[PDB]
Amino acid sequence: TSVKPIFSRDMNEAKRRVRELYRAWYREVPNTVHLFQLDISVKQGRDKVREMFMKNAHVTDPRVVDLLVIKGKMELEETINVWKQRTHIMRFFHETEAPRPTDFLSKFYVGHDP
Amino acid sequence: TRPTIRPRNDVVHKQLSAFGQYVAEILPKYVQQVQVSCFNELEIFIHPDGVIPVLTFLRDHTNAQFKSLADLTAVDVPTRQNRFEIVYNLLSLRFNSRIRVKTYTDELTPIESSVTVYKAANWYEREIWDMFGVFFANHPDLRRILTDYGFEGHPFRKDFPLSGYVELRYDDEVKRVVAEPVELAQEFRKFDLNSPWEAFPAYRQPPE
Amino acid sequence: SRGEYVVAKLDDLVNWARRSSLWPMTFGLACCAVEMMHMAAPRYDMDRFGVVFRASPRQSDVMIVAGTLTNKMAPALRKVYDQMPEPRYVVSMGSCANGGGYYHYSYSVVRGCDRIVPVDIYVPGCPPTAEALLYGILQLQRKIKREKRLRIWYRR
Amino acid sequence: TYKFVNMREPSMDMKSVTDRAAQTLLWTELVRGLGMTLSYLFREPATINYPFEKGPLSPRFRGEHALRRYPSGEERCIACKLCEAVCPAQAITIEAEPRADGSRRTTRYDIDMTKCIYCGFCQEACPVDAIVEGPNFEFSTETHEELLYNKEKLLNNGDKWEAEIAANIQADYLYR
Amino acid sequence: LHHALIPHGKGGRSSVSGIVATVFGATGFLGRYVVNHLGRMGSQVIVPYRCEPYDTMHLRPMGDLGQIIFMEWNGKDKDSIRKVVEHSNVVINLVGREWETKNFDFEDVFVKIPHAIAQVSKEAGVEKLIHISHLNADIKSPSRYLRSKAVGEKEVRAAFPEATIIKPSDIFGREDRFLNYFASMRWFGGVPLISLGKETVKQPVYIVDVSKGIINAIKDPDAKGKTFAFVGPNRYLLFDLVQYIFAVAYRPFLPYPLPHFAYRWVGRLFEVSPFEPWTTRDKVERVHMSDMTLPHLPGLEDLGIQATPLELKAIEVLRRHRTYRWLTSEMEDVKPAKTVN
Amino acid sequence: LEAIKDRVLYVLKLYDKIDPEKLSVNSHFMKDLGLDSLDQVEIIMAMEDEFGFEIPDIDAEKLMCPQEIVDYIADKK
Ligand SMILES: COC1=C(OC)C(=O)C(C/C=C(\C)CC/C=C(\C)CC/C=C(\C)CC/C=C(\C)CC/C=C(\C)CC/C=C(\C)CC/C=C(\C)CC/C=C(/C)CC/C=C(\C)CCC=C(C)C)=C(C)C1=O
Ligand SMILES: CCCCCCCCCCCCCCCCCC(=O)OC[C@H](COP(=O)([O-])OCC[N+](C)(C)C)OC(=O)CCCCCCCCCCCCCCCCC
Numbered sequence A: 001t002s003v004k005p006i007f008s009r010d011m012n013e014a015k016r017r018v019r020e021l022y023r024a025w026y027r028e029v030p031n032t033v034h035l036f037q038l039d040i041s042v043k044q045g046r047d048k049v050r051e052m053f054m055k056n057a058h059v060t061d062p063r064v065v066d067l068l069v070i071k072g073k074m075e076l077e078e079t080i081n082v083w084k085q086r087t088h089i090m091r092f093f094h095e096t097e098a099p100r101p102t103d104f105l106s107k108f109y110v111g112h113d114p
Numbered sequence B: 001t002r003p004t005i006r007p008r009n010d011v012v013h014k015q016l017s018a019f020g021q022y023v024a025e026i027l028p029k030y031v032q033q034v035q036v037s038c039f040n041e042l043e044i045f046i047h048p049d050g051v052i053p054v055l056t057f058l059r060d061h062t063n064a065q066f067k068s069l070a071d072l073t074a075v076d077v078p079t080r081q082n083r084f085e086i087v088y089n090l091l092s093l094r095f096n097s098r099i100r101v102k103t104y105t106d107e108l109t110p111i112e113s114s115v116t117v118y119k120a121a122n123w124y125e126r127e128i129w130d131m132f133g134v135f136f137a138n139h140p141d142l143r144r145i146l147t148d149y150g151f152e153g154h155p156f157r158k159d160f161p162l163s164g165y166v167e168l169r170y171d172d173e174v175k176r177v178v179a180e181p182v183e184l185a186q187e188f189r190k191f192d193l194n195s196p197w198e199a200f201p202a203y204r205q206p207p208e
Numbered sequence C: 001s002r003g004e005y006v007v008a009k010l011d012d013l014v015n016w017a018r019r020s021s022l023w024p025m026t027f028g029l030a031c032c033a034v035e036m037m038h039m040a041a042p043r044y045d046m047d048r049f050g051v052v053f054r055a056s057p058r059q060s061d062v063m064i065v066a067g068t069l070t071n072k073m074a075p076a077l078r079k080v081y082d083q084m085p086e087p088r089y090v091v092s093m094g095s096c097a098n099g100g101g102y103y104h105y106s107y108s109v110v111r112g113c114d115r116i117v118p119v120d121i122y123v124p125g126c127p128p129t130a131e132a133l134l135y136g137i138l139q140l141q142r143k144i145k146r147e148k149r150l151r152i153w154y155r156r
Numbered sequence D: 001t002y003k004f005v006n007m008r009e010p011s012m013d014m015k016s017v018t019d020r021a022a023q024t025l026l027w028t029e030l031v032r033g034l035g036m037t038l039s040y041l042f043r044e045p046a047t048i049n050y051p052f053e054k055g056p057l058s059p060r061f062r063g064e065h066a067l068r069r070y071p072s073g074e075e076r077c078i079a080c081k082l083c084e085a086v087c088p089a090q091a092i093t094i095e096a097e098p099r100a101d102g103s104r105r106t107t108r109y110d111i112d113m114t115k116c117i118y119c120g121f122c123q124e125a126c127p128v129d130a131i132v133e134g135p136n137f138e139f140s141t142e143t144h145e146e147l148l149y150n151k152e153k154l155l156n157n158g159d160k161w162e163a164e165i166a167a168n169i170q171a172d173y174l175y176r
Numbered sequence E: 001l002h003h004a005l006i007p008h009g010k011g012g013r014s015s016v017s018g019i020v021a022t023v024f025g026a027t028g029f030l031g032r033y034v035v036n037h038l039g040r041m042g043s044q045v046i047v048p049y050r051c052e053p054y055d056t057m058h059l060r061p062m063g064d065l066g067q068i069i070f071m072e073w074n075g076k077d078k079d080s081i082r083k084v085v086e087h088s089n090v091v092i093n094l095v096g097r098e099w100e101t102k103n104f105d106f107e108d109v110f111v112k113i114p115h116a117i118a119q120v121s122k123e124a125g126v127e128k129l130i131h132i133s134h135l136n137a138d139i140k141s142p143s144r145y146l147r148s149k150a151v152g153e154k155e156v157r158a159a160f161p162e163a164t165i166i167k168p169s170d171i172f173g174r175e176d177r178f179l180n181y182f183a184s185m186r187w188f189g190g191v192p193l194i195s196l197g198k199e200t201v202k203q204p205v206y207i208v209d210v211s212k213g214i215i216n217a218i219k220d221p222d223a224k225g226k227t228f229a230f231v232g233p234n235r236y237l238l239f240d241l242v243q244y245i246f247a248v249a250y251r252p253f254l255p256y257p258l259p260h261f262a263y264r265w266v267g268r269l270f271e272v273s274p275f276e277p278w279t280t281r282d283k284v285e286r287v288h289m290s291d292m293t294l295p296h297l298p299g300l301e302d303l304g305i306q307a308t309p310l311e312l313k314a315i316e317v318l319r320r321h322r323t324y325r326w327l328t329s330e331m332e333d334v335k336p337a338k339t340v341n
Numbered sequence F: 001l002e003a004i005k006d007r008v009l010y011v012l013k014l015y016d017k018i019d020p021e022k023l024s025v026n027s028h029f030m031k032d033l034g035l036d037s038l039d040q041v042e043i044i045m046a047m048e049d050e051f052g053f054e055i056p057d058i059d060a061e062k063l064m065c066p067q068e069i070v071d072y073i074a075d076k077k
């Protein structure tokens, strides 16, 4: 019904805020790679930014989109201020987790997981 | 005498009831309910958008000088439509009293920040946001306060597992601490303690 | 043999100095760090044994992990441990550092500092008394006494 | 009632002004602090000569755990799991079954001493005085696994410390 | 299978992988990586060590409670070898040294010890043996190191016919010799190269790829009695490779030719060190030797591993050798070296 | 304007998701080239990287053709 708008009254304003946040995250990857002394490429960082933006592409609620951009802005400011360490930036990549099988036969061989 | 039973104070009960009626009359637009618990605690349930008016009244009014904010917290009740319940505990030094104000909200509805009324609301609302997911509208600096950097989820919600989803260890291959899915050497043993017999008839709910 | 005897005496000299001059880093996390203060206190004077607190990790030989290690603190603990130059030792004090402790089944706590750093001594208690921590320190000294680095090298 | 901790004003007579000027120019309170430290220097130190001297303890002290026996040698524990229920830290694991003679006895009794918070609730909740928290506090190990006690280790602790455990329980059982 | 060897869990720290592995030479470069991968998947690891126990401390966090077990062993002691391999179904052989000490020779560390490990393991009932050799293991090699590798490979195959013999090319990583050997030559003025490094072709392999292949060879049921070659994707001339190393480290690269006999004399000078030598004559021979091409042998692709190019992981190793002026330079700031493919 | 067009085409051809043969000065990003919002945002940011002036979000959303890009640059000099 008539729900309270948090930041955006319509999905177009939410898309605008998403684009602004994407520009901010895109323009900060070189600085992050330089400051944190990461061993990844700038292209890898931008690909990760796109991938993290793109796993929420199914959302059709302007309030959920507003909350997502709020949390994205908070975690952008954690990166800029170097509050995060190299540990967290690399936690975005799961470099230590083993490749989880995705086919029925492999899951059947491994164990009881659905 | 009754040595093992807590004595009651009907004078304080009457004073709190009178002040609750006073506040409910002064602020009809927002106050939805007023209660006085039998251990003499006044509780005022308001509509969620009367937070700033009601708190400013309780702070600045001459007959209610609640200048101090003792606490600010939330309670998660998943069975409600508005699961989150914001609780304000105020202390009046002039009249040596304490009051409670209660508000409700859900995940997607913001609550106006009360940092313009009390300065302690800053960190109190940061903690509420961090631990429950409640967003406060005009907050000077709203970010995580207690959880780890990049921590996903709000741990104090009832539907959050006790041990969370990830755990940390040091990996020698990458020479850094890593985050991996949680995995317990001994799983937490959940005990069913509730007795099948009713303890307090005075709180018995109608069969409905 | 002559060389065997010489290297034995040399590493006895080297182990004696290391065991007799222990410099813990000033690193306390929680209530267990109060018992460390009481070990420093006059009743169980730790400076008497040659054990002196230093603030810089570069000038520290022992890390006494005394308190609960959280997920937000584990990177900092590992960082200071790495910045300690070798030889370096770790004493995990109390339940929270040994394993989880009272906070084992929590989303925010590391279940033992031995997931982060190599631990040499484990002192149990909540909190271990100052005498218990002192016993752990002396046990660490006796463990240092058994090191044979030059003896291993000569036969290597 | 209340009192003011700093609300006095100095006297402005010439003698008092000269005394304060002398204190400023001649460091009187600084020398007074020096005298206090020198007095402590000539006092006797409070340091005990550990490990040859030990600090005072009481019968109520909670140290290492132990499983006790009756004078006949029979185990006191009847596998009632009250200690497991009451344990704040979930540090006790118990599994039981009928013994060959039909006794209600434990087959597994574990205490994770790295999870234990040494609160003593298990010996309050024990109805037969089986599990106790003994007087031993110097049991630090070199590996984590050595701190995960089992039934054999706890029975060994009880057998080693039984005399002192019995004496402490005798001394303190009238307060319980 | 025994009921305690059945896998349980999700392949995490607190799971059970059904692998009981005795890792000889775990107190080294490849050893620490293999132990890390095993403990990470949640296996039982036995670490025989001859060194000071202080030097085995970095392996303690690698596994859950009770999963890493340390036992003392002697290389020339079949009794200790049996003690450590008695209860394990996998035995991994990473024992080797790049120089000859007073008590152990290349024949001892590469022929006598591997044969004893393979022979005792067969008696003890060990199901799988993994043995690490070198890619250029040639019986007629100029290098005594590689001749011993060839002889020991033959002896291991004879003693334990169901072995997996793995032949890495030149492993590079944080604690390696390769990149650090080439990057530490800045102290001795210029870089001495035989034939200016124009007659040497090398394809190094990455340490994580090597350890992942070793782990996958354990889990592969049809690699029982086989021989693999672990090589990188790109082959480089030695001059190009060293020039790229110095470019990534941001050090001034001044290569000069050095005749083979003079370089042998220099290597003989450095091998009188009682401690770990900086370089040796066999090290010089191995550096000058080109990596062999063995297209018949299987490889990392056959074990399911995509080999990691040097251009992606070189900055991990070589950033330590930069100066403060150049520490923060990014990975893509240096153009890749020319390959010979 | 020819220099502006050349610089715009140079930036576009460097983009990995643009096919150089399919690219033209009147190719629509969403329709002809089949890109989405984030790709167009990246392209506009790349244009900012070249000509060194700030393009706001409101103006950037009206730059769906290379000809529109060169027109915007020319108007803003
Ligand atoms: C993190 O939270 C926490 C806190 O909050 C911060 C706390 O507060 C606490 C509680 C802790 C405290 C309150 C501690 C606070 C205490 C203090 C501030 C005071 C304690 C005292 C100190 C800190 C002093 C420290 C001093 C130190 C460490 C000095 C020791 C160092 C050295 C001795 C090395 C330097 C000396 C050298 C190198 C000697 C060299 C000599 C020579 C070379 C001479 C030889 C020369 C030759 C040529 C040899 C040849 C000689 C010959 C041949 C002669 C022989 C001939 C003969 C005839 C014999 C806790 C637990 C906590 O958790
Ligand atoms: C520079 C100073 C000059 C004046 C010196 C005056 C006397 C100094 C007295 C104090 C000595 C201090 C050292 C104490 C420790 C003793 C051990 C020690 O020194 O070990 C050193 C090093 C030790 O190597 P290390 O680095 O492994 O040692 C680490 C320390 N350990 C292992 C002991 C714990 O020993 C050697 O280098 C000896 C082995 C043979 C090396 C051959 C090198 C040849 C010459 C070098 C240059 C070659 C290229 C030239 C190119 C151009 C040619 C034209």
Ligand SMILES: CCCCCCCCCCCCCCCCC[C@@H](O)O[C@H](CO[C@H](O)CCCCCCCCCCCCCCC)COP(=O)(O)OCC[N+](C)(C)C
Residues within 6 Å of the ligand: C006, C009, C010, C012, C013, C016
């Ligand atoms: C400042 C300038 C120095 C320059 C360098 C010169 C160095 C001078 C030599 C210094 C020698 C110091 C000797 C230390 C004596 C040890 C004291 C004794 O107690 O040690 C015992 C034995 O310690 C070791 O076994 C031997 C250490 C000393 C011997 C070293 C080798 C001989 C020194 C000579 C140099 C080596 C050359 C040999 C030929 C190459 C063990 O006792 P400990 O358990 O701790 O005490 C615990 C406290 N209690 C008793 C209350 C419980």
Ligand SMILES: CCCCCCCC/C=C\CCCCCCCC(=O)O[C@H](COC(=O)CCCCCCC/C=C/CCCCCCCC)COP(=O)(O)OCCN
Residues within 6 Å of the ligand: D024, D025, D026, D027, D030, D031
């Ligand atoms: C016949 C005519 C002769 C003419 C000469 C007359 C001169 C004799 C009378 C004047 C002498 C005055 C003494 C001079 C020294 C005064 C220094 C001073 O200024 O006093 C203190 C400053 O001095 C200090 O505060 C000392 C701080 C450090 C103290 C820590 C160590 C001191 C304790 C050790 C005692 C030292 C003993 C000295 C022994 C020397 C052995 C060689 C004032 O500072 P404040 O109180 O902060 O206020 C000023 C602004 N309102």
Ligand SMILES: NC(=O)C1=CN([C@@H]2O[C@H](COP(=O)(O)OP(=O)(O)OC[C@H]3O[C@@H](n4cnc5c(N)ncnc54)[C@H](OP(=O)(O)O)[C@@H]3O)[C@@H](O)[C@H]2O)C=CC1
Residues within 6 Å of the ligand: E024, E025, E026, E027, E028, E029, E030, E031, E049, E050, E051, E074, E075, E093, E094, E095, E096, E097, E098, E104, E109, E132, E133, E134, E135, E167, E168, E169, E170, E171, E177
């Ligand atoms: N890394 C490389 O460039 C390549 C290596 N290889 C081979 O892979 C294996 C592992 O290589 P790497 O990690 O680099 O080698 P390291 O030198 O780093 O490690 C060697 C290991 O073997 C042990 N060891 C050495 N000699 C003896 C001995 N006499 N008795 C008992 N233990 C001994 C060492 O133990 P401790 O420290 O206790 O003495 C250490 O654990 C070796 O066989 C090597 O030849 C093959 C191709 C390339």
Ligand SMILES: *P(=O)(O)OCC(C)(C)[C@H](O)C(=O)NCCC(=O)NCCSC(=O)CCCCCCCCCCCCC
Residues within 6 Å of the ligand: A014, A015, A018, A021, A025, A029, A032, A033, A044, A045, A046, A048, A049, A052, A053, A054, A056, A057, A058, A059, A060, A065, A068, A069, A071, A072, A089, A092, F036, F037, F038
């Ligand atoms: P066009 O506008 O049609 O398409 C736009 C997209 C693709 C986003 C969607 O089609 C879309 O508009 N979906 C609508 C729902 C939506 O708004 N989705 C996006 C939500 S905003 C959001 O998800 C922000 C997330 C923050 C990203 C975190 C960044 C972390 C990266 C770490 C980088 C570290 C490397 C150094």
Ligand code: SF4
Residues within 6 Å of the ligand: C030, C031, C032, C066, C067, C068, C093, C094, C095, C096, C097, C101, C102, C125, C126, C127, C128, D117
């Ligand atoms: S083990 Fe006990 S005393 Fe020590 S830090 Fe934890 S809760 Fe505090």
Ligand code: SF4
Residues within 6 Å of the ligand: D083, D086, D087, D088, D089, D090, D091, D092, D111, D115, D116, D117, D118, D119, D120, D121, D122, D123, D133
């Ligand atoms: S002392 Fe407390 S924490 Fe320890 S086993 Fe007993 S009940 Fe559990």
Ligand code: SF4
Residues within 6 Å of the ligand: D076, D077, D078, D079, D080, D081, D082, D083, D084, D094, D122, D125, D126, D127, D128, D129, D130, D131
């Ligand atoms: S409370 Fe006592 S009798 Fe009951 S299970 Fe525990 S130790 Fe045994």
